[PDB]
Structure formats: structure tokens, C-alpha cells
Amino acid sequence: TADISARDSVGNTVLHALVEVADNTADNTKFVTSMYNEILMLGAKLHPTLKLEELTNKKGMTPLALAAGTGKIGVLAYILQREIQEPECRHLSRKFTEWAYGPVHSSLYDLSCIDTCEKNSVLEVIAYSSSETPNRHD
Amino acid sequence: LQKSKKHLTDNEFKDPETGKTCLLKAMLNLHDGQNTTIPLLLEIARQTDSLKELVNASYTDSYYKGQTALHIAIERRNMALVTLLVENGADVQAAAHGDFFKKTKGRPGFYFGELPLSLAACTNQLGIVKFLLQNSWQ
């Protein structure tokens, strides 16, 4: 069986590598976000106590921060508005709903790794980005 | 509850700090549009005296003040439970006064007009509109 958790030479796990391969085009974004889901969902079926997204490569970067440091807005949009409806893969959701009375519904977005966190905040990695770093502004 | 009274004892078994009798609790935690305790909890109340004080009951808190169980069935889009409750009383003029149910307030909430007929009109339930005006009883 392959190792979901294994790393490459540069420390990038599979999910990091789904971020490196993204190129901000729709068909790639449609796909990578689909495939980002499935391994990320699969890693709750097998190895249910890991939290892949917390894994840091050689440069100390998570797949979320690496999507934000490298200009990957589609993957970033996916990871941040992520809502998974399956029961045993709900904890891997990130956009929740706390109530829905009629047309109104109150969503909750996690703020892990966005606010002034430990290693690399998504706001810092976006705000303090190098100038090339595509879609700094989006 | 047969062997004491069922009447005050249900009123003492209203969830404190909310006023939820067992009836309102049931439609909250539904499964595929039915709990299967809702028919039973009506059976406890029709045999043993004072059926009205279960259906006319509502939240006691100032924040859901007046939200009878009839309002619940209208939001959850259960045509049946609207039929079931109005048979057993369940006043169709119960004013959901609560702060959740008041004008915009700059806070979370849904204003529909405080009355169950206005809830159905503002919920896309036209069947429940025509029902509440010509049902058979009230």
C-alpha cells in the first residue's frame, strides 16, 4: 500500500505536490481541487488520526501556505471554502454551517493557519509575499 | 407520567432556559422528515388530559419568545407535521415574538412577520399557505 504521508526529496507530500502542479487555469483547478479532496478524504478512511494538511515540507510549508506562497488561488479557494458532507470525512471540512432558518444560513470558516499562527499564516504568506508570487492581489 | 398527572410534570420537563417541552424538541431532531416519537408524544397528550399545553407551548426565552412547534414544521418543509399539529390544536396565530424573529437588528436573524402564515409565504411553501386558510379546523 502506498504511503499517503510519505515525502519526496524536497519534503513535499502528495498534497504539497497537488499544489506545486496547479497553474491557475480552470480545468487544472477543477481537477486538482477534485483530487485534493479524494486523497484528503481517503486519508480519513485509512490512517484516521493524521491531519495531512498540517504536514510541513523541508521549507516548513503546509499545502495551504504553499498554495498561498505560490499564488495558487483556486486551490486556496478550495481549501478555505472546503465543506465535506460525508459523516466520517466531515472533520476534514473547513466551511461549516451553524444554523439555517429558512433562506438564511450562518457559515463558519475555520481560522487555523490564517490568523497570527505559529509557522506561516495565510495572511502573512499572502501579505508578505515576494512580488512575482502570482495573484498577490486576488 | 400516567401515575402522577402528565400536566405539570411535562411543564416541569420543559428544558430550562429555553422552555422546550418534548414536542418542540422532536421536530428539531428529525430524520428523513419524521422522528416517530412525534406520533407517540401526541398519544401521551391525547389520552392523558391537557393536550393543548403541549402544542400551544413554545420557547420561554426572550430570544425565541412565542415560537411554537408549529413554526418548526413550516421551516423544515414538512407538509405532514403541519397537518398533524393543526389537527390537535396548534394555534395558527402564534406570534413568534423573539429577538431572532424581530426586525433586522444588525444581528443574525430571519424576519418573516412573526405569524405562521407569513412564515410559509416567505419560505416557498404555497401548499402550506392554502392549507392554513382552508384546512378543516382552524
UniProtKB/Swiss-Prot annotation, chain B:
Residues recorded as bearing Phosphothreonine in the entry: T9
Annotated compartments: Postsynaptic cell membrane; Cell projection, Dendritic spine membrane; Cell membrane
Binding of ATP, residues: K20, K25, N29, Y64, K65, G66, Q67, E75, R76
PTM comment: Phosphorylation by CAMKII seems to regulate binding to vanilloids. Phosphorylated and modulated by PRKCE, PRKCM and probably PRKCZ. Dephosphorylation by calcineurin seems to lead to receptor desensitization and phosphorylation by CAMKII recovers activity.
First and last residues of every ANK repeat: 18-50, 68-93, 114-138
Signal peptide (UniProt feature, chain positions): none
Organs and tissues of expression: Widely expressed at low levels. Expression is elevated in dorsal root ganglia. In skin, expressed in cutaneous sensory nerve fibers, mast cells, epidermal keratinocytes, dermal blood vessels, the inner root sheet and the infundibulum of hair follicles, differentiated sebocytes, sweat gland ducts, and the secretory portion of eccrine sweat glands (at protein level).
Subunit structure: Homotetramer. Interacts with PIRT. Interacts with TRPV3 and may also form a heteromeric channel with TRPV3. Interacts with CALM, PRKCM and CSK. Interacts with PRKCG and NTRK1, probably by forming a trimeric complex. Interacts with the Scolopendra mutilans RhTx toxin. Interacts with TMEM100. Interacts with PACS2.
Function: Non-selective calcium permeant cation channel involved in detection of noxious chemical and thermal stimuli. Seems to mediate proton influx and may be involved in intracellular acidosis in nociceptive neurons. Involved in mediation of inflammatory pain and hyperalgesia. Sensitized by a phosphatidylinositol second messenger system activated by receptor tyrosine kinases, which involves PKC isozymes and PCL. Activated by vanilloids, like capsaicin, and temperatures higher than 42 degrees Celsius.
Written domain comment of the UniProt record: The association domain (AD) is necessary for self-association.
Further details from the record: Responses evoked by low pH and heat, and capsaicin can be antagonized by capsazepine.
Family: Belongs to the transient receptor (TC 1.A.4) family. TrpV subfamily. TRPV1 sub-subfamily.
The name this protein goes by in its record: Transient receptor potential cation channel subfamily V member 1
Organism encoding this protein: Homo sapiens
Name of the gene encoding the protein in the UniProt record: TRPV1
